[PDB]
Every structure is written in structure tokens, then in C-alpha cells.
Design a protein around this ligand. Structure first.
Ligand SMILES: Nc1nc2c(ncn2[C@@H]2O[C@H](COP(=O)(O)OP(=O)(O)OP(=O)(O)O)[C@@H](O)[C@H]2O)c(=O)[nH]1
Ligand SMILES: Nc1nc2c(ncn2[C@@H]2O[C@H](COP(=O)(O)OP(=O)(O)OP(=O)(O)O)[C@@H](O)[C@H]2O)c(=O)[nH]1
Ligand SMILES: Nc1nc2c(ncn2[C@@H]2O[C@H](COP(=O)(O)OP(=O)(O)O)[C@@H](O)[C@H]2O)c(=O)[nH]1
Ligand SMILES: Nc1nc2c(ncn2[C@@H]2O[C@H](COP(=O)(O)OP(=O)(O)O)[C@@H](O)[C@H]2O)c(=O)[nH]1
Ligand SMILES: [Mg+2]
Ligand SMILES: [Mg+2]
Lengths: 420, 429, 53, 420, 429
């Protein structure tokens, strides 16, 4: 009932999906041999469990990254759409030249895993917006499936280009050429940026050596928490469509912010006091989230708080009302009680309470400027443009896309400071 | 499903390739005689016991090919890949590109076709050659032309040893080095400028030796090539295929002339008294006294930098040190390319060649920079060219072999335009 | 998520072990370099004796 | 209820704070690990008790002091906000240039520790007035919090420099720059000087080598006795606002002298008993106080006395009437029955009676008068002035600041000769 | 979280640096062969086991810098921290300040930049130059210029060795000691005048050693500088800092020339037969007999006095001694500074170097006096300049290095400005 499929693309997407499957197996208690020790997994002969996740990528090397790691034996070999070349940081490869060669097979496999269900609650993808493979392939796939099932929602835990600490040089091109479509045919485009992830890992946990595994662990835990009000009972349950109804006023402001709690280092944990007020105060701060857009620089059009554990619902709701009345300026007024709550009845494994914050705020607009501004300084000289120009693109396909991006961000402004 | 062809032409190309195959056969546990007591890129299973390297060695003077056939690795190669001519190059162009090179180019193309059929997941070529010579330019130009009109999509990786400002081993090297540009632009994708005087000084100060030799130069170039291909050959938290180069370093396919840099080049005793963490190593990587080309980037700008960190290196330190180095004031980027550093990581350290002077260290960084200062080098060379062609020096040795003299100025025409194109991309908008 | 092994707890051990390994290799290389240098000097002396004879 | 956040700052501030906290712990019966053995402390998981106090310094060395010295494991590993450069005994450094970078974070942590209270009675500070870090950062924090929480009080246990026993050379500048702000954004600046402490530990206790720790302990005892009548029941209760009203008759005449009783040498301990006659005869002494200003050179506007232990209140009140009616000149006439008492029910550890004498007198104008001189020379030659100019602060301030100083003492002097 | 870079230029500078690093390596027990069987301010872990010090040693004369390269510390330093030229400078300023040093300062400043970006919380510099030395004064002045134009915000605390008022070891020192005045005055915030004759009298009347030598003086100066850095190094009941040291002794940014004093300098016989009270040690740290810069402070006046003690002291006793000193009549202060004493305490009593005549003492005091009697020194030195420049003697050696002699009058007027300024501030209000 209300099942989900899990498409993954690109190296970042596939690694984060691996981490998320380890975390899900940790919660539901499934050791890597796929035995117990229907929302996500599927049964197979002998009581075996196989996750309904299709893994796609252009370069085959990532196989040795998803099969080698622990819990990598849960997947099924028939769910691996692995090409042979690797789009190699080029968008047009995964969308016009190579994309349309594996898109057919991945469409076949996702349809096979979709018809095997009865109530397809929706899709959720994991990929990046900067890498050519991830961006291109996932964008073409999202396009075709929103053309296929126009009724089911499709969340994307898609990371974004890091604001300051960049690792590629063709980033803004891919970022814009994928946003131009994710603004059109997506519903919950949860955005994550490596800079804010390092900020959390360096200021909220005081860690010392963050490997990509740790950032992936954090984002995967948040991924689990955002939908872990569905797999379990709830004093006030919820699901994906409840979020989709309570979190987007207008059909194009659907890029959210993600935060998790609690998070403590060795000493802090040895001293911290875990109570609903403290979790609330830690949750609605600035650098407890995964988006380098300081929320005080904007206002939350709306924001859901998914609590988990055994708490006092009156404390939760009174805390929501109190934090809305306290920082009344940082919120928006033309939507009263703009904060939403939801409560599950079971915490994560190894904890006793934990909250997941999902905020549709107008603060992310700053991001959609800076990266966009990058494009403006790399397209006004045709820098690196001959590559995409050679594979079949056109200048209009760029410019209008940019404008669309502009349009999108302007929308926030146009209906951020409005009232009656 | 990954492999690269390594064509070695000329004289310097074949020696640096000999050293490169030494390093490769070393780090993969391969024994130099071919047997074995992660290699599908360079070497390959032959069908009976041994392993053969993907390489063809063209040359006209049989001395170096004979030295390879009677050196240490005589059983390694395949006795067909060693194509040996009958005459010499005499340090001109038409005798390796118009008259005699045509006697060997077809056999070369047949051998290269065989090597291509024997492979499945092709990724590119690695040609090594001097240009200050006679066959490394002529036969190299002809082979580049034949490949570009024969294969097409596969990108070529030229490694050209140019003449340095002061040190000189031939008086007619400006002529043929200018002659080779008429074909380096059109057919070649990536050209990595390597001089010698810079490598001489590098071996002098860092490695503390005072009697360096061509073998040491070749060892260091082999090290850089191995660090280049580690991403294909081995593991890494952030792998970098050979298409990331073309999609990250080539703004316009007419300006693609990169220059190298490597670290840490330290002797034994000078690492004992040295911390050498990631921050220090990425500070040293940019020091123009460590570049592998005679050029002072202080008088130029940077377009892009592919940095590959091999060895036990965490990514966050790389990101922080990148932020610092980009924040410095004396190393300025162009405005039309604000984000420039393309960084990749591999979890394997360097593998020192036995009997070398370099010290083995847990970490290493190889930088390949597409910059705009290298342009002045070309300008300098033209200067030399003019001071000869103003008096029609040595034109007879070229016109004697059908070379229509009208090409010469044309080269100094085309190359000249090239410089203006750099003057077109240093324009701060 | 209360604790994440992705943080390095025993950083001191990593640092000290790498230091000791580096010192060991540096010692080996210093010894082999001194050996090579002395062999070169003795070969030069041999050529000296040949010329004097 | 009536929680009190204890901010610290500066080297001497942190030393006195650690001493005060270890004394309070050994009073409330809290072992150095945080278990029993809300006004000050705060609960923590497992039954631990952490002190609701915030440390701060522009150099990190003091950190490894407070954690090293006994009773360091109590403080929360989050409240340790610290810097690297160090104001280096330069007020402009620690009030405009460097400290101003950390004041935002200090405000955030104070706002997080003040939202977690039901009824916040007020604040309390402890910091030098000569050290750059202490004076500068503390007074900037004071301005911030007093523009934040106007309804509540702001007490500062500042330690003014005694001119005779000097430790620094640029001290008067910091002194006047701190007093110009404490006159404007504070409520009870009970000053302390080292000359009186050397005299007391040198004459009234017959010690031999007075360690800074020991004078710090004396100040800590005075500070603990100040507010004890709130933490424990009492036949005549008190707080930090009854004190704040029965003392200051003018919004700027708020500089108090402290005094502890009884203090007697170890060798003479087994001698004369401890009853309210001896406590009274020992309390009102000129050289029993903690301020190098002989009250014989002035008068008292008001004098509160907080008794601890258990005694017949009638005897206390009779002795009060007697001491006022025999020492009538020392009490100014235009305020009748100017002396106040407040008796608690629990003595400190060891003793059975205790006296905290808090006097708002007109005899500490000298404690500024002389300092005024220490300024007027060192300024009209611009001695060391350039260290204050090159950091942004303009010379003008000093001038006007000195004005206020004069105005301050001027006010005091008027109330010495306004007879009725 | 705190470090300090030391620079040692010239011959006397590098000698006192040798002695100072000896004393330091003894203080933290760091063996003079590098490896160790409170230090991060000075040393740094060099990536493999041992330690390296944070200092560069510049000297064009390869005599002493090679003497160290072969001495008992060649395993401690890093062979790139030892810079040598090809010859000496021969006592004339313009030799090692305009022409020859121009090339070496580049490599020096590069090393310094590498050290800086290797350190974390660098607080200040500590240069050394015997201004009589042509190479010393010249190269030090050049380094100061280049650092003040490069670094800026960071502080610099020179420790220079002048020519004594009456005894001298060269004839052209009063020339190349005046030229360095502007450099050390405008680009350096501190200065500490040292002079041998004063230390010679101190040794001859305290330690009874009748025939002293340089090495004793250098050990004693090392002791003073160690007592200086003791605050940043070790614990302390009442600590100071270089950031506080500057802003408590510099009343005006152009009168900061401070002299020094130290106590107790006593051998074993005068140690056992000694009460050694804090009162007596402080009342001895004022005697113009044992002032480490020849002058009569009694006839001058004091402005500020830092008193950094070490060992077990009672702050009550320290303050009582301070009071009974301010009671005295021979040593009077200016009016515009009522509180003239800053003090500081530490918690490590002095160290003892086997090979020195100083005795192990539980307590110690180092006093830095910023006074106005120091101007007298300049006067006498200035005197010498006249009796030379009146007749242009030796000026031709200067002009023979590109420095036009017109700079002499400029430097002389610049120093006359100070010579007049000091004798002006020493009045009432
Ligand atoms: N770095 C490096 N350069 C080399 C090496 N061997 C030769 N060179 C360069 O080759 C150039 C000499 O001219 P050649 O390359 O021999 O001329 P050619 O075109 O090969 O013609 P042939 O000599 O007949 O083979 C010089 O510039 C050398 O710097 C080597 O082993 N290492
Ligand atoms: N206190 C002290 N002074 C020294 C010492 N060694 C040399 N000096 C002084 O150095 C000054 C002479 O200048 P130097 O720097 O030594 O001469 P230099 O470095 O050879 O300069 P050039 O001759 O121009 O190359 C004299 O005043 C010496 O007293 C020492 O060990 N201790
Ligand atoms: N938080 C996080 N970001 C990653 C990770 N791996 C890659 N990224 C970033 O994701 C971008 C590349 O996306 P990728 O999945 O490799 O697609 P591709 O480049 O087209 O193959 C780069 O900016 C990487 O830095 C990871 O493991 N965790
Ligand atoms: N009564 C007492 N006074 C102290 C103590 N420690 C320092 N002081 C004084 O505090 C003053 C230094 O001011 P401070 O703010 O702590 O220095 P900063 O941190 O560098 O700004 C000096 O006058 C010290 O004498 C102590 O332990 N007890
Ligand atoms: Mg040839
Ligand atoms: Mg010299």
C-alpha cells in the first residue's frame, strides 16, 4: 500500500542511494543477506527481500561502488542499467547522444517494477545537478515519466552545485540545463549542497575528517526521516501527498530545505539534554540545515516538522505555535499558521526521539542567483560552449533556460513580500 | 573496457616512453621480461603467459630501437611494434613528412589498426615526441594527420618536448618546430608543453643532484604520466576519465595548449626535514619554480587546472586549500571562468622506480593547467624563426625535398594568428 | 546517528604510525644513496688509477 | 524560578568565575562530576547538573585553565566561545575590531540560554575593567543584552584597578572607557580593588603568601553570600530586585561596595565566639570592606546587610538601631532609617552565621577621582593614544567619556551637601 | 595556536642565534640531533619523527653558516633554512643592501612565506643584525623593507647589537649603523639595544670571569630572550603577550627604542651565600651598573618598564617591591605616565646550559625599560658620524656600490629628528 520506487543516477546519486539503503536496512532490521533479522522492499523466493531501486549510470565503475560496499547484495542484477562510456561531466551526452540509448532500457525496467505494484504512491530519485551523467540522464527520465504517469508525484533528493567550494568547471551549464526542466516536471525537489553539509559536519558535530560517506550518511538519514511517518503508525499520520499539499502554494515553488535533529559530538552528547524544546530550538536555527541560504535572509512560505518517538503532542504543537509567534518576522504573514506538524509513533533505531524539518522557504532564491550569476559570466564569452554546441544543442536552448531560471527566482520575490 | 594506445615516435618520445613502460611494468607487479609473478588500460593478455604493452615504437635511426631490442625489456614488447627505418632524420622536416616518412606511415597505420581491433573500450592516444628534431615532428605530423582523418572522435594527447630558451642541442630546431604547428593545431586535442631547462633546474634544486641526465628527465615524465592515468587504472573517491579533460580544459578547440606541474619532487634527506601535508603540497604545486615549462605564470592568467591527488588524501583538506590558493592575490584567474579547479582523488600513493633519486611519499599532487601565459613562449620562438628566415638560412635543405617554401611563412602566419587568439581571451570583460 | 564512525577518533595513532613509517623509509633511502655515492667515487678512483698507469 | 545566567569574561573574570562556581558547587553539595552529594544550575540527562554559565575570552589559553582546575567538568562544552588573536590589553581591540566578530555568537548562545527559562530574574557578570578582552567584550555584551532585555536587571562584579598596586600601564584608558558604559547600561556595579584584598588577607587573616586564587576565593564568598537569601528559605526573604530598589535612589548612583563577615585568622579561630555583636563590630570596619575607600572620608546613602544562619531577629534590629543612632554622621540625613536588613535561614559551609554588607555610599567617588587623575595626565600628552586610534575608535570618545566621569562624581558630591 | 618566526642576519646575529637555539633545544629537552626522546611556538613536527625550528639564517659570508652546517646541529635545522652567498660584504651598507643582496632576498622571502603559510597563529618576528656588519645591517634592512611591504599587520621585534660608545671592533661602523636607522625606525615597531662593553662589565663584576668571550655574551642574550618568550611558551599565573608587550611600552609610534636588563647573574659561590629575595632581585634590576646597554639612566628618565619574572614569586612581595622602588629618588618617572610598571609571571624557573658560568637559580627577572636616557647613546654615535663625514672619509667605498652619497645627509637628518625628539618629551606637561 502506497509504494515507492527508487531511481538513482550519477555517481553521487548512486553512492547516496547505497548509503540510504544501508540506513533503511538498519532501521527495518535487515542484514545484507536480505532476510528479516512492502513499502520499500519486495519479496522473493525463500523469504528474501530485494529493494525496489533501479540503479543506472553511464560509467560501469560505480558498480564496484554499489556491489562492493556492505548491504550491496540486496539489489538484483537485472536492475543495473550500466553503459560503457560515461558521459564525463558533459550534459548533452546524457540527454541527446548517449542518454537516448539507455533511457529505453531504464524506462523498461522502471515500468516492470512499477506494474509489479498496486498503489504507486510516487517516485523518488537521487542524483546531482552538476555532473553530466546524473543531470542529463535523470532529467530525461523525469521528463519521460511525468509524461507517462501524470498522476503520481516524483520527489527528487537532488543535490545542487556547491555555492563556494566547487570541484568542476562546467557546473553552471549543467545546473541551469537541469533546473530548466526540474522547475517544470517535479513536485518535491529537495535540494542539498555540499558546502552546508561541511558546515554541519564541522560546526554541529565537530568532526575532523569528513569523507563523502559521512555527508551521504547524513542526507540519507534525513531522507529516511522525511518519509518515515508512512511506514509506521502515527498519532497523526502523514504521507508524501500531505506534504505536497501543505508545502507548495503555487505550482512552481517546489524546491525545499532539509534539516535533521538531534546532532551532537562526543562532549555535547555527554552533556546534552534531549527534550522537545531543545530539539525545536536546534531545528529552526540557521546552520542545522542542508542549504547554504541563511533562512533569516528570507521567510518560510511554509514548513513541516515531522517528529518521531514517543512525545507529548501538546508539547509539540505548543512549541510550533510558540516558535511561530516568537520569530514572527522571519515567517510570512499572508499564510496564517504557516507551520505544519506531523507525528510518528516510533523513533529511529538507537534513539528515543528525532525530528526532520522540511521547509519551503523563499530563502533559497539567493542560491538560484549565485549559480545563475556564474552562468552569466561563463556564457557571455561562449566559454566551453562548443562542446554542448557540437552534440546538437542550440543557443536558444541555453538563453531561454537561463531566463526561466531568472523567472523562477523572480517569482519568489514577486510573491514573497505581498499581502492584501 | 578501458585502454589507451601509446604511440611513441621520434627519439625523445621513444626514450621517455621506455622510462614510462619501466614505471608501468613496475607498479603493476609485471616482471620486465613480460610475465607476472588493474592493467587492462596499458598492458594486455597476449594468449600465452606473458603480457604485452599497448604501444608502437616508430623510428628511423635503428640505434634506439636496437637498444630496446637488446636492453632489459627485450621480451616485453611484440617484435612487430618496433618499427625501425633504414636512414636517419638529419634534423629536417621533408625527410620525415614528405619523402621518406611515406615509406613507413602505411605500415604504421596497419599496426595501429591491429592495435585498435585488439581493443574494445578505447579512450584515447598518448603520443610522445620532441619537436626540435627531424622525425619527431615530420613523421609525427603525418601520423597525426592520418589518425585524425582515419579515426576521428578519439582525442589525442600530445606530449611535445620543445626547445628551451638557453639550452640548445640543434641549430635548426626553430624551423621544424614552427613547421609542426601547421598540424599540431588541426589534429591534436591536448598538447602538454614540456621543456628541458625547467626540468634541469628542477632536478638541480629539489633533487639536490648536480649531474642530472636525460634518464632522470624521463623518469620524472614517466611519473607524471602514471599520475595522469592512475584514475583510469586504479581506485579513487573522485575518478577522472579521459573525457573530463576535454570537457574541462578546452574552452575553444583552437586554444588547448596546457602545461604541467608535479609535487612533491623531494630528495631523501630533504623530506626528513619537511612536514609536507596537503596544504604545503598544494602551495608548492603552483610555484613557477616547479612548473615543467619555461614560463612564469605571474605574467599570465589561468583558465583551468586539473589537479589529481594520488595517495591517502581526504577531500575536505583539498577543498579548504583550494579556497586558500584561489584567495591569494598574486595568482589571479580570468573573470570569464570563475570556478577553475577540477580536482580528483585516487587512493594510491606514488610507486617509486627502484634506483631512483626521488623519495617515496604517501601523497602526491599532479596539476595540469590550461593557462594564457604559455602564449609568450610561442612569441619568443617566432622571434628566433624570423632572425633565421630573414636571411633565408637553411632553406635549401628543405626545398631540396619537395617542400614548397611558401609553407614556412604560412606557418609563421598561422602560429602568429594563434597568439592573437590568446590576446582575444585575456580580455577582461 | 548518535555517533558516526566517519569521524576519526584515533587520529593520533594514524599520525604517529605514518611518521614512523616515513622515518623508516627515509633511513633506508639515505643508506642506499650513500652506498651509490661511494660506489661512484670508487669507480672514478679506478679511472684515475688507469690513467696514471 | 528566578534563574540567573552568569556570564564571565577576561582572564581575571574567568578565574573568579571558576572559583565562584566551585564554591557554589561545594555549597549545594554538587561533586565535581555533576551529581548531588534551577536558580543557578540546570538539569542534564542521567541526573547530571550543569551550570547555566557562559565563558568567553579572545585567547584560548584560559580554556585549558578552567578545564584543568577543579570543577571544570561541569561547564557545558558548547558555552566555551573563544577567540584566537586576543584583545591583548587594548580596549579598542576587544570592543570594536576583534571582539565584535564574536559578539554575534555570544548573543546567540545567550539567547539560547535565556529562551530556556520560565522567569529570568536577571544577569550577572564578572570581568576586569583594565584587560582588553574583559572590559571591552564584557561591556559590549552588556550594551547588547540591556538593549535586549530591558525589564530585567544587569549586575556586574567588576574589579576596578586600585591605583597604588598597579599591574598595567594603559589601565586608566580601559577603566574610563568601561565606566562610561557601565554608568549607562548596568544596575549594580559592585566594584572590587586589589589593595583592600591584600590588606585583608594581610592583616585581618594573618596569611603569609596571598595567592591570587585566595583573593578570588574571598570575592567568590562575597558573591555567593550576596544572593543566598533567594536560594534558601528565610524569616525575611530577599532577591536581586528588592536589593535593586532599596539601594539606588537615582538611576545612575549605582556603584556599591561589598563586605564579608566574619573573617578571622586560623590561629585565632578557636578564640572569640561568633554572634551578631562581633559580626556587627567586624562588618562596619573601614578596612573590612573590599574597596580602597575609607568611609571616614564620606558617608553612606544606603547600606543593606544580608545575614545568613539563624538568630533572634530582634537582636539584629536592635544592633542596627544602635549602630545607626551612635554612628549618625556616617549616614546622610535626608534619607531616614537608611539601613536595611535581610535574614536567611541557612549559613554557608563551615560557619553558622554570615554577613554580606552591601553599601551604596558617597565615599567611592575617590575610587574614581584618583583614577580621573590617572587619566588626565596620560591623555593630555596622548600617551599610548595611537594604539587606540589605529583601530577605528576616534579620540573624541575619550574626551566625552571623561566628561561623564566628572559628571558622575559631580552628582555624588552634590548628594553629600544637600541637607534637609 | 601561537607561533613566532625568528630571523638571524649577519655574523653576530647568527652567533647569538646558534646560542639561543642551543638554549631552547635544551629547555624543552629536544636533543641536538633533532628527535625528541610547550614547543609549538618554536618547533614543528617535520612529518617524520623529529622536529625542525621556525627560523631562517641568512649570511652572505659562508664561514659561520657552513660552520653550523657541519657542527653539532646539522641534523636539527633544515638545509634550506641556511642561506649563504658567495663572499662577504665588508662592512659597507650599500654592498649587501642594494646590489648583491638583491638576488638573495628573493629566496629568503620565499622561505619566509613558506614558513608563514606553514604556521597557524604567527604573532611576530624576531630579527637579529649587528648593525656594524655591512652584510648584517644591509640585508636586515632589506628584509625589513620587504616584509613590511609584504606582511604588514604582523609585528616585528628587532634585537640589534650596536657599536659600544667607547670600544669598537671596526672603523666604518659609525657609517653603516646610521644608514640602518631609518629602516629599523619606520618599518619596525620595537628595538632592543645591546652592547658588549656593558655585558663585559656585568660579567667581570658579577660572575668574576676575568677573560670573557663572545660565546658567554651570546649565552646570556639567549637567556634574556628565553625569559622573554617564556610567557607564550609555558604556563603563568599572570601572563603577558607580544601583542600586549608592544601596546604597553610604545607611548608614541616613533619612540620605541628600549634597553634591557636581567637578574640574577651570579655564579655558585655568590649563589649559596645569597638570600636571593624578590626585593633584592628587583632592586638590582635597576642598577645602572648591570644595564645591558651602556648609559646612565639616573641622569635620564624612564617611561615604561616591563618586568617579566619566572620561578616562584609571591605577588604580594612583587607589588611591595614595586612600591618601595617607586618610593626611591634616583630613578624618577615622567609625569605623563603614573603607572609605569607592567609585570608578568611565569612558572618555569631558568634553565642551565652545561658550558655556561651561570648558576641554577629558582627565580629570575627580565626587565625591558623604555626610557629616554637611551638617546644619549645615539648622541655619542652621532658624534662619530660628524668626525667622519666632515672629511668624506671612506665615503668613496659607499659611492662605489651605486648608492649616491646624498642619502647620508638624509639618514643623518632622520636620526637627528629622534635625537631632538627624545630630549623634548622628557619634560613636564
Ligand atoms: N626530456 C627528454 N628529451 C629528449 C630525450 N631524448 C631526446 N630528447 C630531445 O630530442 C631532441 C634531439 O633531437 P631528436 O629528437 O633526436 O631529432 P629526431 O626528430 O628524433 O630525429 P632522429 O634523431 O634521427 O631520431 C632534443 O631536443 C632533446 O631534448 C629524452 O630522453 N628525454
Ligand atoms: N654580543 C655579541 N656581538 C657579536 C658577536 N659576534 C660578532 N658581534 C658583533 O658583530 C659586529 C661586526 O659586524 P659583523 O656582522 O660581525 O660583520 P660581517 O657579518 O662579516 O659583515 P661584512 O664584513 O660586511 O660581511 C661587531 O660589533 C661584533 O661585536 C657575538 O657573538 N656576541
Ligand atoms: N554530499 C556528496 N556529494 C558528492 C558525492 N560524490 C560526488 N558529489 C558531487 O557530485 C558532483 C558530481 O556528480 P556525479 O554523481 O559524479 O555525476 P557525473 O559527474 O556526471 O558522473 C560533483 O560536484 C561531486 O563533487 C558524495 O558522495 N556526497
Ligand atoms: N583579585 C584578582 N585579580 C586578578 C586575577 N587575575 C588577574 N587579575 C587582574 O586582572 C587584570 C587583567 O585584566 P584581564 O581582562 O583579565 O586580561 P585580558 O584577558 O588579556 O583582557 C589585571 O589587572 C590582573 O591583575 C585574580 O586571580 N584575582
Ligand atoms: Mg629522426
Ligand atoms: Mg659578514
Amino acid at each position: 500500500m502506497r509504494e515507492i520506487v527508487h531511481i538513482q543516477g550519477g555517481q553521487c546519486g548512486n553512492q547516496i542511494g547505497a548509503k540510504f539503503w544501508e540506513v533503511i536496512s538498519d532501521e527495518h532490521g535487515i542484514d545484507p543477506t536480505g532476510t528479516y533479522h512492502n513499502v520499500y522492499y519486495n519479496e522473493a523466493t525463500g523469504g528474501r527481500y530485494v529493494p525496489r531501486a533501479i540503479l543506472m549510470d553511464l560509467e560501469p565503475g560505480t558498480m564496484d561502488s554499489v556491489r562492493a560496499g556492505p548491504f550491496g547484495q540486496l539489489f538484483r542484477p537485472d536492475n543495473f542499467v550500466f553503459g560503457q562510456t560515461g558521459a564525463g561531466n558533459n550534459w548533452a551526452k546524457g540527454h541527446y547522444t548517449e542518454g537516448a540509448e539507455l533511457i529505453d532500457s531504464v524506462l523498461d525496467v522502471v515500468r516492470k517494477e512499477a506494474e509489479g505494484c498496486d498503489c504507486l504512491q510516487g517516485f523518488q530519485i537521487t542524483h546531482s545537478l552538476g555532473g553530466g551523467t546524473g543531470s542529463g540522464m535523470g532529467t530525461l527520465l523525469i521528463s519521460k515519466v511525468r509524461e507517462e504517469y501524470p498522476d503520481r508525484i516524483m520527489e527528487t533528493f537532488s543535490v545542487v552545485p556547491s555555492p563556494k567550494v566547487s570541484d568542476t568547471v562546467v557546473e553552471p551549464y549543467n545546473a541551469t540545463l537541469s533546473v530548466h526542466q526540474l522547475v517544470e516536471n517535479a513536485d518535491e525537489c529537495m535540494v542539498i549542497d555540499n558546502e552546508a553539509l561541511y558546515d554541519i559536519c564541522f560546526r554541529t558535530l565537530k568532526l575532523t575528517t569528513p569523507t563523502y560517506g559521512d555527508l551521504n550518511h547524513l542526507v540519507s538519514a534525513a531522507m529516511s526521516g522525511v518519509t518515515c511517518c508512512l511506514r509506521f503508525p502515527g498519532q497523526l499520520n502523514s504521507d508524501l501527498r500531505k506534504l505536497a499539499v501543505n508545502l507548495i502554494p503555487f505550482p512552481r515553488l517546489h524546491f525545499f530545505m532539509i534539516g535533521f535533529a538531534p546532532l551532537t559530538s562526543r562532549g555535547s552528547q555527554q552533556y546534552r539534554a534531549l527534550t522537545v524544546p531543545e530539539l525545536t530550538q536546534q531545528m529552526f536555527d540557521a546552520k542545522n540545515m542542508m542549504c547554504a541560504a541563511d533562512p533569516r535572509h528570507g521567510r518560510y512560505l511554509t514548513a513541516s516538522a515531522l517528529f518521531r518517538g514517543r512525545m507529548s503532542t501538546k508539547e509539540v504543537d505548543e512549541q510550533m505555535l510558540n516558535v511561530q509567534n516568537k520569530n514572527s518576522s522571519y515567517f510570512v504573514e499572508w499564510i496564517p499558521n504557516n507551520i505544519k506538524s506531523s507525528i510518528c509513533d516510533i523513533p529511529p533505531k538507537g534513539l528515543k526521539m528525532a525530528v526532520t524539518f522540511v521547509g519551503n522557504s523563499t530563502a533559497i532564491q539567493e542560491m538560484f542567483k549565485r549559480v545563475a550569476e556564474q552562468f552569466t559570466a561563463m556564457f557571455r564569452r561562449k566559454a566551453f560552449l562548443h562542446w554542448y554546441t557540437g552534440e546538437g544543442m542550440d543557443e536558444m536552448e541555453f538563453t531561454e533556460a537561463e531566463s526561466n531560471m531568472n523567472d523562477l527566482v523572480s517569482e519568489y520575490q514577486q510573491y514573497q513580500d505581498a499581502t492584501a | 573496457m578501458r585502454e589507451v594506445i601509446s604511440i611513441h615516435v621520434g627519439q625523445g618520445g621513444i626514450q621517455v616512453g621506455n622510462a614510462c613502460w619501466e614505471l608501468f611494468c613496475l607498479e603493476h607487479g609485471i616482471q620486465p621480461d613480460g610475465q607476472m609473478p588493474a592493467f587492462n588500460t596499458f598492458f594486455s593478455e597476449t594468449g600465452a603467459g606473458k603480457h604485452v604493452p599497448r604501444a608502437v615504437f616508430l623510428d628511423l635511426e635503428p640505434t634506439v630501437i636496437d637498444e630496446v631490442r637488446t636492453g632489459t625489456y627485450r621480451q616485453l614488447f611484440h617484435p612487430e611494434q618496433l618499427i625501425s627505418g633504414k636512414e636517419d632524420a638529419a634534423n629536417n622536416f621533408a625527410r620525415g613528412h614528405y619523402t621518406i616518412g611515406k615509406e613507413i606511415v602505411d605500415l604504421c597505420l596497419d599496426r595501429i589498426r591491429k592495435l585498435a581491433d585488439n581493443c574494445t573500450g578505447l579512450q584515447g592516444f598518448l603520443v610522445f615526441n620532441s619537436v626540435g628534431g627531424g622525425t619527431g615532428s615530420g613523421l609525427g605530423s603525418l601520423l597525426l594527420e592520418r589518425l585524425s582523418v582515419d579515426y576521428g572522435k578519439k582525442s589525442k594527447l600530445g606530449f611535445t618536448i620543445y626547445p628551451s630558451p638557453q639550452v640548445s642541442t640543434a641549430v635548426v630546431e626553430p624551423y621544424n618546430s614552427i613547421l609542426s604547428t601547421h598540424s599540431l593545431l588541426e589534429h591534436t586535442d591536448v598538447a602538454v608543453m614540456l621543456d628541458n631547462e625547467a626540468i634541469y633546474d628542477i632536478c638541480r634544486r629539489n633533487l639536490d643532484i648536480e649531474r642530472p641526465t636525460y634518464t632522470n628527465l624521463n623518469r620524472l615524465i614517466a611519473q607524471v604520466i602514471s599520475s595522469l592515468t592512475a584514475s583510469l587504472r586504479f581506485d579513487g573517491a573522485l575518478n577522472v576519465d579521459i573525457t573530463e579533460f576535454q570537457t574541462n580544459l578546452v574552452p575553444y578547440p583552437r586554444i588547448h595548449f596546457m602545461l604541467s606541474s608535479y609535487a612533491p619532487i623531494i630528495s631523501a634527506e630533504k623530506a626528513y626535514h619537511e612536514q609536507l601535508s596537503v596544504a604545503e603540497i598544494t602551495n608548492s604545486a603552483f610555484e613557477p619554480a616547479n612548473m615543467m615549462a619555461k614560463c612564469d605564470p605571474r605574467h599570465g592568467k589561468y583558465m583551468a587546472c586539473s589537479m589529481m591527488y594520488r595517495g591517502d588524501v581526504v577531500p575536505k583538506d583539498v577543498n579548504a586549500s583550494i579556497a586558500t590558493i584561489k584567495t591569494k592575490r598574486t595568482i589571479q584567474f580570468v573573470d570569464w571562468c570563475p570556478t577553475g579547479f577540477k580536482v580528483g582523488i585516487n587512493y594510491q600513493p606514488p610507486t617509486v622506480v627502484p634506483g631512483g633519486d626521488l623519495a617515496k611519499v604517501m601523497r602526491a599532487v599532479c596539476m595540469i593547467s590550461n593557462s594564457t601565459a604559455i602564449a609568450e613562449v610561442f612569441s619568443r620562438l617566432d622571434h628566433k624563426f624570423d632572425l633565421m628566415y630573414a636571411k633565408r638560412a637553411f632553406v635549401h635543405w628543405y626545398v631540396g625535398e619537395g617542400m614548397e617554401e611558401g609553407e614556412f611563412s604560412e606557418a609563421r602566419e598561422d602560429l602568429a594568428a594563434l597568439e592573437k587568439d590568446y590576446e582575444e581571451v585575456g580580455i577582461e570583460t | 546517528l548518535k555517533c558516526l564512525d566517519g569521524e576519526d577518533l584515533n587520529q593520533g595513532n594514524r599520525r604517529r604510525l605514518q611518521q614512523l613509517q616515513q622515518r623508516d623509509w627515509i633511513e633506508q633511502q639515505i643508506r642506499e644513496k650513500e652506498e651509490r655515492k661511494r660506489q661512484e667515487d670508487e669507480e672514478k678512483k679506478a679511472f684515475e688509477q688507469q690513467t696514471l698507469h
